[PDB]
Amino acid sequence: SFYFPGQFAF
Amino acid sequence: DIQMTQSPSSLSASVGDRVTITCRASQSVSSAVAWYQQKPGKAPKLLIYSASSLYSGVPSRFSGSRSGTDFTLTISSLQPEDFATYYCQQYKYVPVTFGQGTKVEVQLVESGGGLVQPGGSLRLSCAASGFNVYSSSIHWVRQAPGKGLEWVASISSYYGYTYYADSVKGRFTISADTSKNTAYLQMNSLRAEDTAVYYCARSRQFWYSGLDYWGQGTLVTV
Amino acid sequence: TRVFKKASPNGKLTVYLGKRDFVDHIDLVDPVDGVVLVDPEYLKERRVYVTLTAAFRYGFRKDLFVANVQSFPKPLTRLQERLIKKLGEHAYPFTFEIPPNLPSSVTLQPGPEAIGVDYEVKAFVAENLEEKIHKRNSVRLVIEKVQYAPERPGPQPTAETTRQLHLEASLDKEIYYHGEPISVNVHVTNNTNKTVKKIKISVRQYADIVLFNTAQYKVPVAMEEADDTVAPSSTFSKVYTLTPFLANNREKRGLALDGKLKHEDTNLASSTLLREGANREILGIIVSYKVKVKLVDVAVELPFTLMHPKPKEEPPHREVPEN
Amino acid sequence: VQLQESGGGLVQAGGSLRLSCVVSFDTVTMAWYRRAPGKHRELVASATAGGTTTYADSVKDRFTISRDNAKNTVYLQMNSLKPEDTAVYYCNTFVRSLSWGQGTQVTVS
Amino acid sequence: LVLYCLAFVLGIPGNAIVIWFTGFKWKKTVTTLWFLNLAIADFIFLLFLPLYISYVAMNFHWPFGIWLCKANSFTAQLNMFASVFFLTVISLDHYIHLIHPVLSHRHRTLKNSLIVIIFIWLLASLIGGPALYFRDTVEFNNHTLCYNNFQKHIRHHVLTWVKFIIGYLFPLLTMSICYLCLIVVAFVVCWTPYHLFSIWELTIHHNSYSHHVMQAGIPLSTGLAFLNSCLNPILYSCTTASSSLA
Numbered sequence: 001s002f003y004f005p006g007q008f009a010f
Numbered sequence: 011d012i013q014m015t016q017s018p019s020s021l022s023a024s025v026g027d028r029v030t031i032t033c034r035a036s037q038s039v040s041s042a043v044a045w046y047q048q049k050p051g052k053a054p055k056l057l058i059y060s061a062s063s064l065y066s067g068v069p070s071r072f073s074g075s076r077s078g079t080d081f082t083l084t085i086s087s088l089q090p091e092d093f094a095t096y097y098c099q100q101y102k103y104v105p106v107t108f109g110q111g112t113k114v115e116v117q118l119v120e121s122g123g124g125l126v127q128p129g130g131s132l133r134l135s136c137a138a139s140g141f142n143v144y145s146s147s148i149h150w151v152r153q154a155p156g157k158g159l160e161w162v163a164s165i166s167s168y169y170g171y172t173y174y175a176d177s178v179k180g181r182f183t184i185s186a187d188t189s190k191n192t193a194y195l196q197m198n199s200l201r202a203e204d205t206a207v208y209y210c211a212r213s214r215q216f217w218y219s220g221l222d223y224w225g226q227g228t229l230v231t232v
Numbered sequence: 233t234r235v236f237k238k239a240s241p242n243g244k245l246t247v248y249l250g251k252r253d254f255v256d257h258i259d260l261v262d263p264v265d266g267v268v269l270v271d272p273e274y275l276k277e278r279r280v281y282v283t284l285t286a287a288f289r290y291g292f293r294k295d296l297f298v299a300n301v302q303s304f305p306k307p308l309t310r311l312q313e314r315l316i317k318k319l320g321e322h323a324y325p326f327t328f329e330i331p332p333n334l335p336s337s338v339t340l341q342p343g344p345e346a347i348g349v350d351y352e353v354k355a356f357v358a359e360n361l362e363e364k365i366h367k368r369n370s371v372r373l374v375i376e377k378v379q380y381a382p383e384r385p386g387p388q389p390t391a392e393t394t395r396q397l398h399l400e401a402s403l404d405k406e407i408y409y410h411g412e413p414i415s416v417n418v419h420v421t422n423n424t425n426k427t428v429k430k431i432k433i434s435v436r437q438y439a440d441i442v443l444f445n446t447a448q449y450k451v452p453v454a455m456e457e458a459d460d461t462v463a464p465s466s467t468f469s470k471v472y473t474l475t476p477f478l479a480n481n482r483e484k485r486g487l488a489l490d491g492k493l494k495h496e497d498t499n500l501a502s503s504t505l506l507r508e509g510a511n512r513e514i515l516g517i518i519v520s521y522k523v524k525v526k527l528v529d530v531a532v533e534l535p536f537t538l539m540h541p542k543p544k545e546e547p548p549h550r551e552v553p554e555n
Numbered sequence: 556v557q558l559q560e561s562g563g564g565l566v567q568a569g570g571s572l573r574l575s576c577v578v579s580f581d582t583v584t585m586a587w588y589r590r591a592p593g594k595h596r597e598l599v600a601s602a603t604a605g606g607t608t609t610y611a612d613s614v615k616d617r618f619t620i621s622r623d624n625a626k627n628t629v630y631l632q633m634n635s636l637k638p639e640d641t642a643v644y645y646c647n648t649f650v651r652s653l654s655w656g657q658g659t660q661v662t663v664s
Numbered sequence: 665l666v667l668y669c670l671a672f673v674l675g676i677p678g679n680a681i682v683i684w685f686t687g688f689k690w691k692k693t694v695t696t697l698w699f700l701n702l703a704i705a706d707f708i709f710l711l712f713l714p715l716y717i718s719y720v721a722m723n724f725h726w727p728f729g730i731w732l733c734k735a736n737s738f739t740a741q742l743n744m745f746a747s748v749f750f751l752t753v754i755s756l757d758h759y760i761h762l763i764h765p766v767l768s769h770r771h772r773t774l775k776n777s778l779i780v781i782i783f784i785w786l787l788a789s790l791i792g793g794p795a796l797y798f799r800d801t802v803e804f805n806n807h808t809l810c811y812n813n814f815q816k817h818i819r820h821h822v823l824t825w826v827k828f829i830i831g832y833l834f835p836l837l838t839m840s841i842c843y844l845c846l847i848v849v850a851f852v853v854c855w856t857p858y859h860l861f862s863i864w865e866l867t868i869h870h871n872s873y874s875h876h877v878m879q880a881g882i883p884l885s886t887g888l889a890f891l892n893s894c895l896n897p898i899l900y901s902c903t904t905a906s907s908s909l910a
């Protein structure tokens with residue numbers, strides 16, 4: 001969860 | 011426009027002489043000049059369609075020549091079959107004008123004409139046979155009693171173009187139908203100067219070479 | 233005779249041509265003849281020669297035929313002698329030779345705002361044959377190259393197709409002139425399945441632009457929409473009169489017309505007749521006329537030609553009652 | 556391009572007319588053209604930009620031609636006019652690039 | 665970081681040069697129609713440089729938060745596709761007119777070009793329609809990166825895949841078919857790194873999710889778009905008389 005896929009980044 | 015004057019207005023001659031009728035156009039037109047012979051009480055007949063080329067049917071005695079703008083008609087022998095008021099035309103521009111007339115001393119059917127006082131409207135028909143509307147150009151020419159031929163209107167169905175004289179613009183409308191091969195002329199607000207014999211003459215739509223065929227007469231009195 | 237001349241903007245280097253319409257026979261091509269005139273001055277150290285270009289401006293003038301002959305160091309025609317005698321001693325003739333298998337002068341129709349095969353004859357004076365010369369010291373006379381109807385009529389066309397019923401079509405004759413109506417027989421022998429409710433008869437020409445790859449463009453110059461219906465297990469026949477003209481084709485795009493000399497309008501493009509024994513790459517435009525009937529589908533194709541006959545005296549190449 | 560000219564008249568014999576050529580020259584050559592009645596148009600002189608004058612068969616040592624750039628005109632004079640030279644004269648470029656304007660009918664008795 | 669600033673600095677001259685299909689003086693040719701279409705597309709793209717700059721450079725986030733982020737990205741995302749889609753169609757033009765010039769009785773009217781542009785805009789809206797049911801709400805790291813999405817879905821692979829085909833599989837193939845040398849390098853260095861990056865996070869987070877080693881190709885995508893926005897504006901007698909004879 002430290003680098004959980006953010007999504008919507010671009 | 012272009013105005014034509016013929017030096018001999020009334021010419022008297024006998025049988026067996028060379029009669030020459032000249033024609034002076036007030037502009038530098040090309041060889042596009044046609045000569046018409048009109049017997050009294052009859053429609054004009056084309057004689058030369060290029061000022062140098064004889065029509066098919068006319069005798070070889072008729073001939074024409076050009077010198078600057080000095081178009082002329084030469085007759086080798088004046089048999090009695092050639093006494094008529096010869097005319098002179100320029101078909102190089104839309105306002106085609108006929109000469110004042112020199113006095114020498116496939117069927118088109120037209121219906122209509124009648125006594126119509128000014129302010130009325132009259133419809134003239136030009137029934138034609140033996141040729142197609144798209145392959146020919148229909149021209150309407152009027153002739154006042156005792157005067158020369160005057161061009162009225164012309165239609166070209168191949169390009170969908172209509173031409174009218176400057177004195178009948180707006181008042182006169184010409185229409186032609188391809189189904190029945192007929193040309194129709196509509197005139198509105200006729201004046202007292204419209205008393206003339208109306209002729210419906212055809213011409214080759216492609217490479218105009220004069221008015222080959224004419225009508226017989228649709229005398230209109232106003 | 234009244235030959236045609238085109239004077240340069242400057243008072244020198246005029247060109248005389250007896251005609252601007254060169255017919256294209258099946259075997260040979262009529263050579264170009266005329267006279268270019270040069271004054272004694274402006275020439276004492278120079279040499280005069282001519283050049284014609286087979287431009288393909290589609291904008292990009294992709295030249296096809298270039299020929300150069302030197303008129304100021306072969307037999308000479310009768311008109312050639314007459315010009316030399318009349319003009320004077322200080323006149324040097326020019327002549328051209330056109331090989332066969334070249335496209336005719338055809339120009340496509342643009343809409344609300346040319347493009348096509350056009351020939352230009354230009355005369356200019358230089359020595360290097362490649363020096364950049366301004367248009368002021370040159371002439372630009374446009375010539376036209378077209379074909380005319382042959383004397384021998386062709387066989388009556390007839391097509392056939394039985395795919396899904398059985399129908400056949402035919403025409404009165406193959407040789408058609410511009411403006412002449414076309415008569416087609418649409419005798420159908422439908423047997424079963426469906427009762428066709430319409431007979432679409434359309435006339436289309438092929439704009440075979442062969443600039444680089446190929447072209448088979450279709451343009452319905454004339455058509456009709458008769459609503460007659462055939463019956464199941466019954467015979468039918470009908471006649472029709474289609475005329476291809478330009479009055480209703482103004483808004484169309486890609487239409488091929490005849491050769492052009494100015495902004496004046498012309499008729500439809502004449503059908504181009506190639507050589508049966510030799511059909512190589514043309515790099516021009518080939519126009520062929522086809523008439524079809526459609527059953528609503530199945531259709532057939534019937535060959536026919538649409539081009540003018542031999543003119544009696546000469547073509548002015550301009551609408552005669554102008555202005 | 557207007558090609559305005561005058562000088563025509565009736566002369567008994569041997570009288571010069573002094574025709575003119577008013578046009579609206581750089582380094583071109585223009586001459587005078589005569590037209591016999593009922594015939595075609597011939598050439599008379601050369602009148603080049605520099606000094607080089609050549610005449611016709613019946614014009615050498617017979618006529619004379621001059622041009623001046625101050626008035627933008629071209630002049631021409633007749634000496635010893637024979638009765639067979641009754642013709643109208645036209646003024647144009649030797650290359651024949653200008654339109655044929657109205658000429659002056661020159662007649663001699 | 666400076667890539668976006670360079671993109672804007674090089675783009676505003678292009679936006680100015682667009683000037684009503686090049687100065688409102690040349691005729692409304694179909695070529696000018698496509699030029700105006702691409703000018704509208706990249707102007708809509710250029711209208712939101714400050715938003716993307718604040719997204720990654722200025723404090724790593726936008727001030728307005730969820731109100732801005734989604735909307736901005738949304739609009740950008742959609743016309744981004746439109747932009748590359750525009751490339752395809754103008755590339756589609758670059759073939760048709762130039763492979764063997766025959767464009768006379770085909771797409772040679774202003775009406776057919778306007779209809780084509782409307783069709784491309786409708787296609788861009790249709791492909792952005794799925795993207796409408798996306799975007800994020802909050803961010804629980806005191807930094808409002810606009811993350812954590814919403815109630816939505818194992819289906820995140822297919823969206824990236826279809827983005828790849830609409831972005832690289834079809835456009836690059838069409839461009840290669842159109843070019844054929846004499847019968848594009850900037851586009852190869854623009855779209856491929858983004859899709860390669862996308863494949864990069866996809867393959868890694870398939871089994872071993874990304875971590876402290878970091879995955880921040882967002883500035884790389886900004887630089888690729890900068891190169892694209894720099895390149896695209898940059899790359900885009902007398903009369904006849906007669907005489908007399910004998």
